[model samples]
Target: HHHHHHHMLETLINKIYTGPLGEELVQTLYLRIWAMEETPESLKILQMREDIRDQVLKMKTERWLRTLIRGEKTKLKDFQKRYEEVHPYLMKEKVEQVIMEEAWSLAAHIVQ
Candidate 1:
């Protein structure tokens, strides 16, 4: 059983995922640790567990951003009217670039 668990962990580690780790991934890791021992060996490991629990909240916020803004060209201040909640998260330059790209797409549509 111990040797099987080691191989399972190696397979999981080989899978590369981008961005912040997901809640399910963190939960699974904790469960694996729990299966081996009743408690972590150090305070640092405990703190890390707590921090990942907080990261679940951040992940939900990011999901909201992905689903909220579809493709609406609107001014910064009046953006709220598009949806009940709309907050810009990009840097100034990035936001400006997005605006330009969106504007060009709109113009192309009109020309067509």
Candidate 2:
């Protein structure tokens, strides 16, 4: 049973990291977490669980990026800016060249 649970967790992690709908899944999860703030205590516990899951997802994403860069250092702010561009909430006109190049490189790595 322990092994089964571990396998299930791995499956979910892989799905979120590599699946075509990964971005959308994360977006939906974030929206649900945001909406759960007004719910009762029981539901809030559920929200906490979801929050932890999101944290794990983020860790996995960051780990993948680190591996992709092969230990080449980049600022956290650059990564955050690029990520926000991918999942934009508002109309932002300007983006830094470094962030754009980083984003393109990540995309190219994923595509290959």
Candidate 3:
């Protein structure tokens, strides 16, 4: 039991917590946002729009998540629940990639 639990934690931290796809997504977005690719006033409104493009990607990602186990109605009924279950890996990266690294950097220096 101890070994199983340790292995599970190690896997969660190494594989799931710092997963490649999700970490990559976060890093990619973080780079774009850090560079102000998404700031409209910076003359990159298109970039800003693209930063949120992931939500649309949901159609593909979510469709496969529930798979044959649940119907779309059921999935949609708890879409966010399922999304939260799966997307944290990617979305955590997204937060690091797109929002926090840049937004907070900007705000932390804001006078107000």
Candidate 4:
């Protein structure tokens, strides 16, 4: 039989997500973690769990950025200015350049 830290799971449930929609999202993520563990550990574990976790975090951050960029409530000038402020420096490294190129190439080929 498999064992789990149910208390920590329950605590995560209570703290991070609540109500039906939140619970549902939690369930999906929970199930995917099991799937991820079983299915090549995601990206051959070249990307660590924490690296993928950061990718998940960026989903929300990018959504927020898109909202700011597209929202009528936001000033376009301000949003673009803020974005450009860090854009050039965002991934200014040879490693980042290669990773970006490779990731896009992989997606373009629809590697599955």
Candidate 5:
């Protein structure tokens, strides 16, 4: 028989890991946040925001992929169980909360 199952697993891993959540939603918000006019101070603020976003998203993505791989190696039920454990923290809502909170703090810094 062909290596269909292995191929399918690879495809699933690729799609789920690098899919829309990683690219579209996060990047769209990033661009919106970066729409401010160009200035030295504003650029510094933007750079800080970019750094925060990168770090937060990187952590989240790493956690997500780890969970995914762990699940893939075990039973489907195990995967589901692990997914439930991390789902809350990995949700879009959590990401939005983090980004907004950081952005607000940065804006406050600018105001002060």
Candidate 6:
């Protein structure tokens, strides 16, 4: 149990939390608002927006993967063209490729 505790502590100490919402971005946004004496309501709204954006992005990505899994010959660019129509933000190409990598890996398991 002592050895397990040490391993858990080591993992926690080394972990760098970063994701769809960047750590630097959150820190910068918070500091700027804090100096301006912003209300908690404003911060809550911003947090909600970030959460919504991430949820929508994941939903759309999964939707595309489903379409891809159906043996559709559609290009990733094909999906991006449609994506730009609806989403406010432009997705980075690196993110697109990562989804592609995942989609292809999933496709391989279908044994077609």
Most accurate candidate by lDDT: 5
Which of 1 and 3 is the better model by lDDT? 3
Error of 6 at 58 (Å): 2.7
**Candidate 5 lDDT tens digits, 15-51:** 4346754454346545644674455533543566655
The Cα local distance difference test for each model comes to: 0.36, 0.42, 0.36, 0.36, 0.44, 0.39
Residue 87 of model 3 has an lDDT of 41
Positional deviation of residue 77's Cα in model 4 after best superposition, in angstroms: 5.6
Query: Candidate 1 — which residues are off by over 4 angstroms?
Result: 1-49, 75-77, 83-112
lDDT of 6 by residue, 4-61 (tens): 3234323332321234323433344334433543455445434566666444334434
- Top candidate, metric TM-score: 5
lDDT of residue 85 for candidate 2: 53
- Model 6 worst lDDT run, 10 consecutive residues: 8-17
RMSD of each: 18.5, 14.1, 15.7, 15.4, 12.9, 14.1
RMSD, candidate 1, Å: 18.5
Pairs in steric clash, model 4? none
Q: What would the per-residue lDDT of candidate 1 be over residues 1-112, giving only the tens digit for each residue?
A: 3443233323332331233333444454444434443333322333465676435433433333334333333322243443333324433433222333332232232222
Q: Rate residue 3 of model 6 by lDDT.
A: 45
**Span of 10 residues, lowest total lDDT, candidate 2:** 90-99
lDDT tens digits, residues 1-61, model 3? Answer: 4443233323433431245643454445435645653334323423445535443222222
For each predicted model, how many residue pairs clash, with residues at least 3 apart or on different chains?
Answer: 0, 0, 4, 0, 0, 0
Decreasing TM-score order of the candidates: 5, 6, 2, 1, 4, 3
In candidate 2 the C-alpha lDDT for residue 55 amounts to 53
Model 1 whole-model lDDT (C-alpha atoms): 0.36
1 or 3, greater by TM-score: 1
Q: For each candidate, what TM-score against the reference?
A: 0.26, 0.27, 0.23, 0.24, 0.33, 0.29
